[PDB]
Symmetry: C3
């Protein structure tokens, strides 16, 4: 395909951004951290387009692969905010992860409404992954709001996965 | 599809159990922990039955894919046990890991007797992953450290053996 | 189908990780020999497949070089062995060095998926190089490892814009 090639490139952007942030952190370099933050954002921004772009075209599977990159970028962006001192990036990484969590439920709702259980479960998996990042973003800021929101989002994915299990075992 | 869809749904139970676990682990709160423990504890029981059901028909993979969920479920169940200090739960999670390694050994031993090379390697991978959890469940009962080491020593011993047979062709 | 050999070598690297994590200075040396065997054996499968043609099995073999060098990197720390840091580093640079070439070859052929898979080994090798470099405090490798990621992000960033022209 063609749209997946960007996503595979975007995933390497988040990966190189994660490595750069880890090697720039301990030896107090803010320049590498300025790359890793910018590298992660655009991989999320480009994934945000491809997620929406694949959703409309009629692909809910290609959209999901983009939604995980929001999770992976918001995950890496949380560290850059955490390792540095920017309480401004943690405010953006949550919105990025929360968007993926919100969109996953939609594709889940649509896939379950169409009878595509497998595609639904992949959306439920990204729902749990977004809850994981949001939970992590909340323990080092002590905000029980994000930790509570993550609880229901993770719990909601839990029950829907329980339902798809019985629906298969008939 | 098929009962595989149950397993993929079961894997999400262990994943969601882990996120809840992490949350209540740090942010002091045992109500989530017993929910997440039960969530993780449940998918482990579900995976155990599908393993047996897959063993009988003939499909060893569905059995293997279920055995991996026992390893992944036992991992989350051990984690709550370490933080919550429940030395009894560390045991149930350990027994869960001990079964998957043992059951994989059969599928590993069985696949090698038929000449199905990578069906064995998939069982050997599940054996090494189960040995890994027990090491964590021990890192300090020194016997279990032998049990986890012993399982790790033999999965390695066979993978280099199976790799000698593949490189000649 | 040297692919079946590679998956077996990964179980060698994995069991070496379990044994190295547990510790017995004998076990740490048995895990060291276990991983160092799968890395030198992955190097052979890489060379043979890269020579006959196959650029994926070479990459699939190179990924175990990163993972074998990664597992051996821990044994170096837990045993206090700066001589071991050389082998784990030597493999990581090799996997990184070979990946760039395989990336270069794949880009000339139009196998953009293959380049990105080769570029992933660049980041995975660059991360290990960084990990091996913060342990002894060698800032030469820490810049070298940073550059490896800076190249992988830079080359993959083009493939992201070059591919969306036909989305």
């Amino acid at each position: 395909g063609n749209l997946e090639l960007a996503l595979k490139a975007l995933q390497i952007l988040v990966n190189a951004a994660y490595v750069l942030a880890e090697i720039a952190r301990d030896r107090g370099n803010e320049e590498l951290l300025e790359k890793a933050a910018r590298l992660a954002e655009e991989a999320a921004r480009q994934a945000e387009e491809i997620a929406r772009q694949a959703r409309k075209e009629g692909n809910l599977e290609l959209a999901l692969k983009a939604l995980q990159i929001l999770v992976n970028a918001a995950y890496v962006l949380a560290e850059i905010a955490r390792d540095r001192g920017n309480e401004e990036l943690l405010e953006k990484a949550a919105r990025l992860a929360e968007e993926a969590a919100r969109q996953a439920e939609e594709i889940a709702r649509q896939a379950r409404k169409e009878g595509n259980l497998e595609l639904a479960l992949k959306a439920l998996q990204i729902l749990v992954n977004a809850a994981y990042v949001l939970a992590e973003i909340a323990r080092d800021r002590g905000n029980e709001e994000l930790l509570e929101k993550a609880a229901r989002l993770a719990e909601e994915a839990a029950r829907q996965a329980e339902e798809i299990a019985r629906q298969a075992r008939k």
